[PDB]
Design a protein around this ligand. Sequence first.
Ligand SMILES: [Zn+2]
Lengths: 503, 148, 542
Amino acid sequence: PTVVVMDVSLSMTRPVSIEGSEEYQRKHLAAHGLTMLFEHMATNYKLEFTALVVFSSLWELMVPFTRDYNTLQEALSNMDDYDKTCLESALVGVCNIVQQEWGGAIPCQVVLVTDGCLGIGRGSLRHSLATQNQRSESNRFPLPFPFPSKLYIMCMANLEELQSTDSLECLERLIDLNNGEGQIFTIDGPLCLKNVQSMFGKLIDLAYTPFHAVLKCGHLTADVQVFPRPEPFVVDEEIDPIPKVINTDLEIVGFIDIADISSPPVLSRHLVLPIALNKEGDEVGTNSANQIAGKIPNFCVLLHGSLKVEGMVAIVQLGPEWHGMLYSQADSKKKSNLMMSLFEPGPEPLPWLGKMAQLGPISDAKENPYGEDDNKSPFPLQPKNKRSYAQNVTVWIKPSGLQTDVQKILRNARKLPEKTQTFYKELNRLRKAALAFGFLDLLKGVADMLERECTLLPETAHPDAAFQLTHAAQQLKLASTGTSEYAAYDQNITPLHTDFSGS
Amino acid sequence: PEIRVTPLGAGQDVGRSCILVSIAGKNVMLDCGMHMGFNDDRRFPDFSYITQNGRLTDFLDCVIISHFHLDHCGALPYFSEMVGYDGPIYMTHPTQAICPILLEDYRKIAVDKKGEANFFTSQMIKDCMKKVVAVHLHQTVQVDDELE
Amino acid sequence: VFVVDHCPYMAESCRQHVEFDMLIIPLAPISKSLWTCSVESSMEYCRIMYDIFPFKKLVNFIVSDSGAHVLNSWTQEDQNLQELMAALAAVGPPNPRADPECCSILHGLVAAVETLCKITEYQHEARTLLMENAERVGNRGRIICITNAKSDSHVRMLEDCVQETIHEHNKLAANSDHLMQIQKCELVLIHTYPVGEDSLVSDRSKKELSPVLTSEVHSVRAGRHLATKLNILVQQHFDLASTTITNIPMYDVELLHHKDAHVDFLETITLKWCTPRTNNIELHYCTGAYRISPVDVNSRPSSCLTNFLLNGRSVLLEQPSKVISHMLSSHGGEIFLHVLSSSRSILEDPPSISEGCGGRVTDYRITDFGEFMRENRLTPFLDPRYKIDGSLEVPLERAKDQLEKHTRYWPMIISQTTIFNMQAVVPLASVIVKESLTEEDVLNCQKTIYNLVDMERKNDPLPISPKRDEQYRIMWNELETLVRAHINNSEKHQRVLECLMACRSKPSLWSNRINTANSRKHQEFAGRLNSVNNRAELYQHL
Ligand SMILES: [Zn+2]
């Protein structure tokens, strides 16, 4: 699991810096950290397994895992020492071990008292955390560990004091260059007593915070209320520069279905607590204590009842005549992903919700919105194109990579109009992708199979899909002029047809 | 930087003692007496001078009572409960002990020997006593951050 | 801005084949034009910008040919690649043969650099409503490419000829359709090309197409510095971050995680592997996520891995706060990855009911409840018709009112019911809601309103499926409930009195400090404001 990156240098047992790191020795800093972070440690870091074991060269997982919740300060308080001193395996080796045996996503609290001292001359090893610019010879190596990790700041030497020998840059450019996570936590100058807990104090009040937000559709009469607040979440920046507010234009619209929903990108934990209340909107009473009050019916979200048979999802009204696509897990009642979300705004319409800003046909339409094999229909609304796993995938980073991506996208995208289950699902995903991307493999294997299937299959469709091939050769032959009047392109192929009389 | 004093009662008379002092933005009432002899509408001080049809607690931060005489504390229950002053009222311990019985006697007089259409009652007298803060001799209390 | 034609005068080969990963008909040639080769690398170029915003618009390209136009689409429906591809390939579809057409630059050299930010009539919005912008434009583009041909000046001949032809007809200098008349500009470009072969190509060679544009080049190896160093600074400084995960569990696959998790936290890469299951509790709601924009956008685990992932759920195999190792998902427009919990969120052993309603929801049979398809038909549309007519109104305020009157609250569950719980509940919205309404349903509902109060202990013919013996007050409660029939929003089911007679019941140091003191003061007395000569009349009403 996650391992705290402790320095394996002999100086780690003794104080830090050339003459003084900050305030008293390491014991005082450890005691201050234990006293200030005890409330946070007992409530937020109860499941973080860290062991204060000895190491010769780098942090390694040898001792059995233990539930250390208030022994973090003990790691730097009267810790054991070993007869080894490896300066090159203190940060680089520990970071590599964390990246490999613990991954870039694991709860790790790298908080300890370490010297972090460079050489007494031209021996500064700044490649441990600043491999991006300094020591470019190792730029192609695993360094500088570009992955999420705990902040390690070494504010031992003062920038003003170390500037006499022109060595201030080496000592100061350590914390700030460590992946640049959010902001540079580096203090240059004199040290005070309160600076010991300054590093640990960055998350004193950053565990939980109250909020006010309610998820509902239109007005309703059994709307769910959410008393506890969730973690911060925002999809865009302009719409959420400050805390969220409620407008006076609530509306409910859109179909809810899981047949053609799939896993969409969700970044909002707008959970609805399951409880039933009157029009006033009180709490109504909201080891598990929910069972006692859960005997009465509850609303929660619209997908609570359908989360088992079909695995439906909960939709949040993003606005009038403008909505989005949500998603939910196949789980029935364990989690169910009971939290709505809306795709982040952008110059293109929705990340996966398609064009939800245009209202057209409602019930009467040429194509049935119900669908047969999760084809393109407005029930539920979704993007016109499919996912990159199926077709319409534009990934060209290398010629071989582009060819492989084209082949994968155009593997089953070449389907003739013989089966109604996928007549309007990927009809235009074969020729356009093969021609625009210039994929020889698709034009050789997929295109020939598609042409053979189309020839074998019936071609008694409407004249737009059948009679258009008679004059196509004439149009191609008579394209020598190349003028703008010889080519027409205003809209692509659409499923709807005109209602003109045949004369 | 001015001390503005407006005695709206007992200015050039004896009775209905009620003096307003604005010293540093702290508006204090120095007494809340009542007049004797007047039949109606002049027994109590004119509290329309302090922006009537509003909350008196915002304007006044402290009300002080010198002693338990009716010309120094008689209008206290009417003032407080009726006009809606929920702020502190300062008065010594014997003043706190002996004030409500004088008010009760005058209330008995008003309900029996005269009319009582526009007078207060015993329950409303007891309601006023809740806001009272007893102050001992030479006890420099801190009613506000800077006012003592 | 401008791209040269597909003249076959200069050609080169890089031995580019199809990289097979697993281990009779004719084969089409892999011949491609220099402009096509340069454009083909633009997909990797957009990967760097995708980190800033993955759901934003993409970038197209236009060249000088027979179809010399800067036609592009910016509409919401046209934002996808299905519609914009036909306008960027207007110069000719992919057909391997000798094409004599489009070789001459005299086909047209006006409205040339208008294919990166110009708007079209496909949308009804304005420029400001879309994205606007000034000099610094997010939709703006430049010319940067690393291809192989005979020389860099071979493609410059067509551009020079086009520029000369444009200059030869400069009479209509003050006339344009919608865009500005571009005169000159300077273009900064970078160097990047796919790996696979040694550096047997130009290292510091720059191509110029017009006197206005004159780029400069330098020796910088791609991949080692272009992707490993530039992307790191381009991601962290663009309100995003990148993580390291295993590519093939046991081409690099890169996950996405925000820096908020790192802030709140305090030689083969090893990661766990698991397969999805139909019945498994391992997926939760992602409170935060990041957009994955890896250079290897066409790696092996991109299509086959996602084939068995249509359920939408993820599977995590925790050792013995669970942390995920890798995730794969295709959202159609961008690839996104989600990280595990980092803040004080109850993810392990959450408030799951795990009993009662939620799984057995079948009270609303689909046999005759499908009449709601008309009253609540407001859904998004992707392709409109030429014109529409019928019983409808503008979609600004009528749609919300119609939905509110039709589907504001349509809950149906058998967990608990005491208002419509009657044996004659057939008159509910499943069949009552119809365009041609009849008074028979209203009369039946009114009769059932009294019937429910009359009888509530017996079971209906349909399968139904504070001490004890409290059912005595149930009849009184039902009678009280029936009294409120003409309440809430039930106008059709309202009943005043029908059969209540039979068995139903009835109811300057001294300046600054003085200013500071006077600034923090309190409201004035009304009488003092209204006073005259520092005196005011008391008891004015008398
Ligand atoms: Zn007196």
